[PDB]
Design a protein around this motif. Structure first.
Motif, PDB file in Angstrom:
ATOM      1  N   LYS A 272      -8.711  -2.099   3.350  1.00  0.00           N
ATOM      2  CA  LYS A 272      -9.351  -1.391   2.283  1.00  0.00           C
ATOM      3  C   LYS A 272      -8.522  -1.331   0.999  1.00  0.00           C
ATOM      4  O   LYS A 272      -7.374  -1.473   1.042  1.00  0.00           O
ATOM      5  N   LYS A 273      -9.168  -1.083  -0.169  1.00  0.00           N
ATOM      6  CA  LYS A 273      -8.496  -0.812  -1.426  1.00  0.00           C
ATOM      7  C   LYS A 273      -7.568  -1.910  -1.846  1.00  0.00           C
ATOM      8  O   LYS A 273      -6.550  -1.634  -2.385  1.00  0.00           O
ATOM      9  N   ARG A 274      -7.902  -3.144  -1.584  1.00  0.00           N
ATOM     10  CA  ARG A 274      -7.084  -4.290  -1.897  1.00  0.00           C
ATOM     11  C   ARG A 274      -5.741  -4.315  -1.172  1.00  0.00           C
ATOM     12  O   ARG A 274      -4.875  -5.021  -1.541  1.00  0.00           O
ATOM     13  N   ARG A 275      -5.591  -3.512  -0.145  1.00  0.00           N
ATOM     14  CA  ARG A 275      -4.407  -3.454   0.657  1.00  0.00           C
ATOM     15  C   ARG A 275      -4.232  -4.689   1.537  1.00  0.00           C
ATOM     16  O   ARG A 275      -5.193  -5.231   1.986  1.00  0.00           O
ATOM     17  N   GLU A 276      -3.000  -5.049   1.798  1.00  0.00           N
ATOM     18  CA  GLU A 276      -2.684  -6.168   2.636  1.00  0.00           C
ATOM     19  C   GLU A 276      -1.449  -5.872   3.505  1.00  0.00           C
ATOM     20  O   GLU A 276      -0.706  -4.994   3.247  1.00  0.00           O
ATOM     21  N   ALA A 277      -1.250  -6.695   4.498  1.00  0.00           N
ATOM     22  CA  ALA A 277      -0.113  -6.660   5.365  1.00  0.00           C
ATOM     23  C   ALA A 277       0.122  -8.048   5.976  1.00  0.00           C
ATOM     24  O   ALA A 277      -0.766  -8.824   6.048  1.00  0.00           O
TER      25      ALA A 277
END
Lengths: 177, 81
Positions: free
Chosen positions: A40-45
């Motif tokens: 979500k929310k342009r989040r990455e990992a």
């Protein structure tokens, strides 16, 4: 880039996520490959993918730490894709989170930070928050910078900078779990 | 038709070594492969991700299946110090 439903982890190591064997094959993923995750929310990992026989093909097993970085809850939907391009880190800068270091004991680096990275393969992303176990507590750190950026793998040769003042946890940095 | 093991191996520079092995064949084969590609036993460790293990420190006389290297795994090389 395929999407999967978020499930609980059977492996708390923050660097790892799990899939079914069939899922992996579909995705042409091998056990131990590094993957790019999107939430979500342009989040990455970035994580290491593992196979897991108890995992439904339609789900991914994902630790709290990862879930938090991705702003997702159990039963939410993430994207996964292979990321073999990730390079070994040259330098990184991390800072402790103020509210997680109230009356710590011992040296921050040696007690808390170093053993996170020591003899461990750790894919990191800029803006990551990660949790360590050192010292009978639960210190958190944020990745405030990497070279290269934004993704890297923390290697034995990687220069780890931690100096500086503890940061305030941002609104969208609160634990969801 | 016989159990096969696919391996992928990251070099310290980011390249990948790929090769299929016989699940039944001894670990030594692996050691020889990596040597062949320029990473000799005495200079480079072959590592697994999780759990973390020094593959090159596992019994060479043991099969791949025996060391849980099946059916596909990505490993990485690291310089010895």
């Amino acid at each position: 880039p395929n999407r999967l439903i978020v499930d609980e982890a059977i492996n708390e190591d923050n660097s790892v996520v799990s899939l079914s064997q069939p899922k992996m094959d579909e995705l042409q993923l091998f056990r131990g490959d590094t993957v790019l995750l999107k939430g979500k929310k342009r989040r990455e990992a970035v994580c290491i993918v593992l196979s897991d026989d108890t995992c439904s093909d339609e789900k991914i097993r994902m630790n709290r730490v990862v879930r938090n970085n991705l702003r997702v809850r159990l039963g939410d939907v993430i994207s996964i894709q292979p990321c073999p391009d990730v390079k070994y880190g040259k330098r990184i800068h991390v800072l402790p989170i103020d509210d997680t270091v109230e009356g710590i004991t011992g040296n921050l680096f040696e007690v808390y930070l170093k053993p996170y990275f020591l003899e461990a393969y750790r894919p990191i992303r800029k803006g990551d928050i990660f949790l360590v176990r050192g010292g009978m507590r639960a210190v958190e750190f944020k990745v405030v910078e990497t070279d290269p950026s934004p993704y890297c793998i923390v290697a034995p040769d990687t220069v780890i900078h931690c100096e500086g003042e503890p940061i305030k946890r941002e609104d969208e940095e609160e634990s969801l779990n | 038709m016989e159990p096969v093991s696919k391996l992928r191996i990251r070099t310290p520079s980011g390249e990948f070594l790929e090769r299929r092995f016989l699940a039944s064949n001894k670990l030594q084969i692996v050691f020889d492969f990596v040597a062949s590609k320029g990473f000799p036993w005495d200079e480079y460790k072959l590592l697994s991700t999780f759990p973390r293990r020094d593959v090159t420190q596992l019994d060479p006389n043991k099969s791949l299946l025996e060391v849980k290297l099946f059916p596909q795994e990505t490993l990485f090389l690291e310089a010895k110090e």
